[PDB]
Amino acid sequence: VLSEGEWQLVLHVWAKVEADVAGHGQDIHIRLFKSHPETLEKFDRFKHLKTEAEMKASEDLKKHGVTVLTALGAILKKKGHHEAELKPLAQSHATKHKIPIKYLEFISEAIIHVLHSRHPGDFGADAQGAMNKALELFRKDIAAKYKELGYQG
Ligand code: HEM
Numbered sequence: 001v002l003s004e005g006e007w008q009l010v011l012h013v014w015a016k017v018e019a020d021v022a023g024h025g026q027d028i029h030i031r032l033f034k035s036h037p038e039t040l041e042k043f044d045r046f047k048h049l050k051t052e053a054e055m056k057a058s059e060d061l062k063k064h065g066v067t068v069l070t071a072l073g074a075i076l077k078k079k080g081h082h083e084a085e086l087k088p089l090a091q092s093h094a095t096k097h098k099i100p101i102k103y104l105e106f107i108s109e110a111i112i113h114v115l116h117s118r119h120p121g122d123f124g125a126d127a128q129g130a131m132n133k134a135l136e137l138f139r140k141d142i143a144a145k146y147k148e149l150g151y152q153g
Pocket of ligand 1: 039040043068
């Protein structure tokens with residue numbers, strides 16, 4: 001469970017993300033694909049992208065990052081009461097895209113990295129710990145929904 005204080009630190013930094021959702025999404029995906037290249041293989045629509053500049057130039061990748069961060073933001077704003085928002089995500093990611101929890105760990109790492117790179121003054125140790133707890137909760141809850149669907153990833 002996160003404390004109310006922890007949720008407020010999470011949402012405080014999230015408001016900074018919301019000032020440029022597209023750019024944050026791009027940096028997060030680029031970091032993810034650079035640090036863990038195997039994850040790019042999951043995206044039939046993006047795996048053709050060969051360089052960082054191609055990734056930045058891709059309107060479809062930029063659009064996708066807004067979709068991803070919009071879904072995550074909607075989840076975070078529920079402060080743990082996110083069943084209705086999380087279930088459809090679990091359904092598609094377990095049954096269609098087949099994304100193991102370890103890949104969700106990888107993108108969580110990319111999120112923390114990008115938020116610190118862009119907002120160090122609003123993302124110190126305590127805020128990072130809070131965001132880490134929020135993403136840990138997201139991953140734990142999605143893993144339970146995965147199992148309900150029969151996926152052990
Ligand atoms: C913060 C965690 C993530 C969130 C919030 C998120 C959210 C979303 C959303 C909202 C969609 C569109 C609707 C849907 O199909 O469910 C989507 C699609 C997709 N996701 Fe994720 N995602 C996350 C992590 C990942 C990761 C790490 C991967 C791969 C390693 C992945 C793979 C995919 C793929 C392949 C699609 C279909 C893209 C397309 O061709 O249109 N997701 N995701």
